[model samples]
Target: TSGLKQLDSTYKETNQQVLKNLDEIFSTKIGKEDALNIKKAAIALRGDLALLKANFEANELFFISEDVIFKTYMSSPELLLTYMKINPLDQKTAEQQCGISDKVLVLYCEGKLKIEQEKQNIRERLETSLKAYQSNIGGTASLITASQTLVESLKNKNFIKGIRKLMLAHDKVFLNYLEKLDALEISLEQSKRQYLQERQSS
Candidate 1:
């Protein structure tokens, strides 16, 4: 029964182990995907960072060429919202959310309400992307851990199997030797008895 257990457990583990994350395989696949996603997110971070920097300069509300245009735009925050009816509606949407359209002095208000706050948005997204990269590194660590564990497991399994085979051959040959000794002793005893009895008869 113990032998049965040894053979069964070893083979079962070996066979079923092939199916196991033997699970790390699949997890590593997932890890690589996370790395790719992190890469894309990093790209997006640099892109949005550039766009916000450009907005700070190109989308600057000040430095109008004409005093009339400057006065008209600067006189009211409402004017910023008025001419903001353009594509990429983020500024307009924020203006509406803040209800800046109801005020007049808001032309210069975007420096506080819009530009700096969008910079905050940029920083927060960068923080999130960093977290994603950290987790991707974590995934790599676990994958290596799993790989090391599997290596040790397979090595032990090989030792176990090799020892079992050696024990099997040793027991068979040893028992055969014991049987030979027993048979030789019995035949010698029989021969001795036959010689003694024949001597007595003579």
Candidate 2:
């Protein structure tokens, strides 16, 4: 070909490749960058959902503690029980009282029963959270898959379709994220509203 043909070919490729690439952009250049954000967000969201898991185990470890009844039981074991037995074992009532002691054990029983019930409730709460957390695991899987697919699309020069997938992917993950947080917030607010009317000032 002529030198003009050679020159025109290079310009033709460069100038119009820019537009062809731009055309791949379909309204704007997006695909990869958005996919990156979604990928990172999905990574963090999965980890955050993982964080939400041990909270159940964590509270089961400590929330099941208050450190009062046993400590007070130590205080009252000899001294208080001694005085209550001061009446002597004249009646069967006194005999039963003699073996077990009094208000201290009562407090212990009350505390034990209350804690057991709450512990059961916590188990249910934990079960519910785990189901949601497990659901998030799957959603995050789909989320990461969406990013991966977008990347693959970009690799094949499938720009517009890639962004189309990305649009739905981003919205779904974001919506679920809001749902996870909202569930915790509403359940927590329900507890805090009436029963915890007396939280310590932070």
Candidate 3:
């Protein structure tokens, strides 16, 4: 029991330390990249929307004038044949009977298309980060739990058997700890890559 208790304490201490490191990675490193990607996408979308708005407002005025000219030609025969030679009148009329509806619709659809694409990109990035976080933490927790169970099961064993069990558990725990650390390093690298990409894009 004494040996098992000491082994358990060592396992718990190691587990606690690894968890603390994981917490720091998630909070400081991974989290910063995640937030940066979100902010990057938002700022990009805002710029796109602003440009779209300006284009729509400008087209709104042009289309209004187009609508007036078309009405004038249709209502007055003197300008009909002369205006018929104007390509703008012909193009606008073909789109939506020279009304502003087609212009507005085109602008709206363009804006919507851009927004949806940007949104999808943002969603994918966030989802990937979430999966990385969950997988790393979940794997570490599972290893810790399994090690705890192995240690607890040795409480009723003989001294030699208990020592043997403790050695096995300790080896497993150490191996798992090393694996987790490697995984954390990979995650940190990935976070750095994402941060760099975002910075370059911005």
Candidate 4:
């Protein structure tokens, strides 16, 4: 129960962080270059979150299935056999012994298929998001190099009025980027903690 609760909490928190990052990207006033960098960061962060979402969702389904199987088998092994259509036990016996009516069986089958379909869809979405991030790697690397060069050149510059303003703007932009990076790092760490907990339980 605690594991399931933790999983639920982590899923909700990850979603909230993703939305917060998106809002920040749209609402904050920053330089064009900074905005681009921030957008890239958000894309990568979302890709990570997508994978985590898929994993956590699959884990949730596994937990639910395990619980249901445990209870069903413990309460009535014969019904479990019937539910699996192993020996084709009487429908009335299934209902009387385990409360599993024909309607319930049909719904259970449908639900299982739906969950599996969702899992595959999530996997596909994650792959697509990941490819988008991968496509930006070169651009991201160039941005990092340009920022480093600007920082190094600042040390040798005289204090001209326009230069001062440009420096201030640059700092502001990079600071915003730094903040976003920090938030993304924290989200990743939270995900790692949840993943570790999941592995421990497994």
Question: Candidates ranked by lDDT, best first?
Answer: 4, 1, 2, 3
Each model's C-alpha lDDT?
Answer: 0.40, 0.40, 0.39, 0.42
Q: Report the alpha-carbon TM-score of model 3 versus the true structure.
A: 0.25
Between 2 and 4, whose TM-score is larger? 4
Off by over 4 Å in 2: 1-101, 148-202
Backbone clash count for every predicted candidate, in the order shown: 6, 0, 0, 0
Better of 1 and 4 by TM-score: 4
| lDDT, model 3, position 51 | 42
User: Which one wins on TM-score?
Assistant: 4
Across residues 1-202, which tens digit of lDDT does each residue of candidate 1 receive? 2563455355445434433533343332555777565555444433443332233222122112322433553233344335433212465755675455424233233323433443354355345434443433322222232334678656545634543353343334334434443443344345445545776775
Q: What is the lDDT of residue 70 in candidate 4?
A: 38
What is the alpha-carbon lDDT for the whole of candidate 3? 0.39
Winning candidate number (lDDT) = 4
Error (Å) of candidate 3 at residue 198 is: 74
Candidate 2 Cα deviation (angstroms), residue 98 = 17
What tens digits encode model 3's per-residue C-alpha lDDT throughout 75-175?
A: 33233333334423334434453344545333323323332343454355345434433333222222222223456324312322332344454344334
